[PDB]
Amino acid sequence: SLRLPQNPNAGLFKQGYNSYSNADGQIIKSIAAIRELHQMCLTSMGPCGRNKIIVNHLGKIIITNDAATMLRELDIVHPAVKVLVMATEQQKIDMGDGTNLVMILAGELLNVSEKLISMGLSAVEIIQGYNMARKFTLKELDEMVVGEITDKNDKNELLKMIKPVISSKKYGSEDILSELVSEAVSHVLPVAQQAGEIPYFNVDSIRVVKIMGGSLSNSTVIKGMVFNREPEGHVKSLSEDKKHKVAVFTCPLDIANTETKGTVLLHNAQEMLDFSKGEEKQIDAMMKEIADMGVECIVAGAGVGELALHYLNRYGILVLKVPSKFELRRLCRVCGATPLPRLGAPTPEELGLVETVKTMEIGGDRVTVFKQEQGEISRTSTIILRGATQNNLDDIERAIDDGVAAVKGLMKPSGGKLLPGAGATEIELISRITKYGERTPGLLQLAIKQFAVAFEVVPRTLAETAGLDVNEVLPNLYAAHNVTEPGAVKTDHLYKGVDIDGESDEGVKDIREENIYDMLATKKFAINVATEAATTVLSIDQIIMAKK
């Protein structure tokens, strides 16, 4: 009476282990545990989304409005929330676009499932309901598609691609940020029209180097690349035309020492006198074959000796440090050189082509530039991103990664296959999925119905973040899809969507003239991985933890 028996036969397992079954409203608590961090994502989706401060134990801060990025640093206790972390991590790695959406949907499917489990629907039927809804959802995304790119390189078409992507992360001004990406995409692409070759594009080609100071308007698009290096011997503006040559060596510019106990041995004074001059003549003789080929800059892979440096700057050969593997490989793709570890003569076919190598003050430190010209184009271009706050450089840099990741979406499938944005693609599926529930019989119809109700979060979120009342903006938009028999045949009611700024009522003046669209490849895997996030959380009825 004074004390319970405190759960007998509990010594089967350790004291730290705990069980969590579906009963006792614990599945409702797991939905509430998702609801804690899901509401943090409500303020972070859309162009009016708000970034988030995340102070780690080390003190490294990252400011961001994306989900996959913010969830990396937060240490999570609930395992069901970690499914959303790895689900968004999969979204960032594969497609690099549409992660707030994964969280927003996989969280609202669990929200509407709170009503379904409370009604009395078995968990097995819930998975069958969303799977049958998923097959119809992915089918209709291919049907209501409009428009296509059909050209890899164009000035006006890239404005339709990059601009709606970076509009979520650090909107700012539209033109100054979009032109930096569309100019850099055209440099790296192998155009090769009327040849029948397979296109190819690498995410690691376009890379952004962060430099403090300046303003966002002063950002330029560099053909080549840049490091924060210092030439050792001398600096040269290189005002001499008639382009220079490039030779890349991965080994250090020094005498190839013996790997096993390299030690001097001098038996008599005759070897003592010649050993000091032998190293000078040997290093000089190797530079003669290198210098006669007309090379004026050599990129070293490791530490360079002083004696080798004395003969390099004699003939005015520039030295560059790249003490890492990937930093040396990215530079060969610009000039198109084939490195060889030997210290002999570079082959003439393997020598690279760089016209000028300038050294100027951008951020107060010494930097080396490798700008090419219109002739003999190169790939793996960089973008000089100027800004005041280092935290803003980090989020804008990842926005270029999201934009570069969107360019990857054009290579693998047959084409662009753009969709209407601004909630139009979500609100259209609500009517189609609702009609699909009426066609199918059985107790799964409520699962099909709640699956459509979960898609309202995109227009509800954009209306809440835009400072508008969602009770008036949402049903005003339903009138465009509740309508029938209106004059025009060629119907233009599909482009109606929400609006962040402007006219009252809100149905946007089309997403058309506005030139904002969404990618099909993002919506396919996002709805697939979001449904898998809700499937794995709803399919499990018992959870076991340890130590907490």
């Binding site: 206790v77 008599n268 951020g363 706050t389 835009a466 400072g467």
Partner: protein, 520 residues
Amino acid sequence: NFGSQTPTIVVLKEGTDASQGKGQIISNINACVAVQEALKPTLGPLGSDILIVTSNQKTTISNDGATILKLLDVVHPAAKTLVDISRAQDAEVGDGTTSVTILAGELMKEAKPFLEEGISSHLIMKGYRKAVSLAVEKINELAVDITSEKLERCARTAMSSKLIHNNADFFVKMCVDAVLSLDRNDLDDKLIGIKKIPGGAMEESLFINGVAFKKTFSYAGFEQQPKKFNNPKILSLNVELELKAEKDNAEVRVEHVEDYQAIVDAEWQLIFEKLRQVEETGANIVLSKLPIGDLATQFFADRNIFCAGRVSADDMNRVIQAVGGSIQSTTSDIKPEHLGTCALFEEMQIGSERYNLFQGCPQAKTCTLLLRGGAEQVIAEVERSLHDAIMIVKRALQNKLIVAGGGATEMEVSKCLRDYSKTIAGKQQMIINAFAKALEVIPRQLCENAGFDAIEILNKLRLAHSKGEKWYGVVFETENIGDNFAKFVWEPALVKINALNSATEATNLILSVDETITNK
């Protein structure tokens, strides 16, 4: 089921900070206003300085926005945006750091009551980002395309708010000559490297056409060499001139004892052969990054050849550009043409420290002055004041743009913003006018430190812009307000553009934030 407790699963870790509510973003603004209060009275020439002592008991005194926030280890996340804006302006410009922080502070402080109202975050950011585009274009019209009259006036204003402002009559005459030695498109900052000399008075400084570096070591034959050469010749070395291992190894087998005497004499033979090649070319001054042994310096000491060592690579690079020579890491490849020359040489006693002076070159790329002072903070303040002024006259050579100082730029931009807000769109009229009066914080505090009443000043500025078209600003000497063009006070426009862009970027960064997560 495995335990009677059944602990409730917390979402985040234990100890994580709080979350959404009322007052989260307001605390970040109040945190910035707190840091902004410390840098508030340091504005203008009639301001003050801030004394800080960190945990390591290192004394420092300064009136700057980058240096004050650098020593202070700011742990608050939203407050480090200011450290960043300051650092950024210093980097790209080196002057007006504080202004940027006070402007950032007032825009966020002015955004405080709008956030208390039902105004969303994106509406406030759209106002500043649309207004700053017109401020940059308006500053281009305020700035002039001046080319006539051929530096002197720009340096006097950059030295304000710190020590050498009153001594501008002597320091500006030689500071203008520092950048004229540098040619176009190079602008090397390491050539303007200046060192510390604890001891002396700042008035006894002088201009030097070359370098002056500390020896940092007393050699055995240092006094034997002459201190005065009429026609010296400089040659830079890199080989180590002493008896030691040759190339990173030491192993010598000897079988016969007769050859054991010869191998030692060979080492003595080659080391003098290494020194004799330096002697035959007539190099009077010898310099090397690596140490120089007692054997070499005594060989040079007999026949009147000065030598020195224990110098850094940054100092060596300044020696080459001053004398116009080159680096030679081998004694056999020495030729007469690569030797640098100057007018004369004289080692002088400076603060109980010896320095090797070079001066009188026909074409010198280097300006390096010795900073002597009483305390270690006096020589430090003279360095930072010159380092901020030298950047202004440096970039003045890059482009010739001049705007009126004394808070005159903020008032002229604010009047057109009030006209632009009066015309259109209704809703953003409050935001742009709020940005207008918030932009006037620079002349606001500039007169409060002077002891004058702000109401009589600010009422005189607004109603007198018609005849004071653009060059209308404050004057501290006559205790009145007049035209700044007659007073010859000038300031470039690059401080103004980077200040508004950095301040607009700073306030818009955390204005798009309504959260704070702190693990552990």
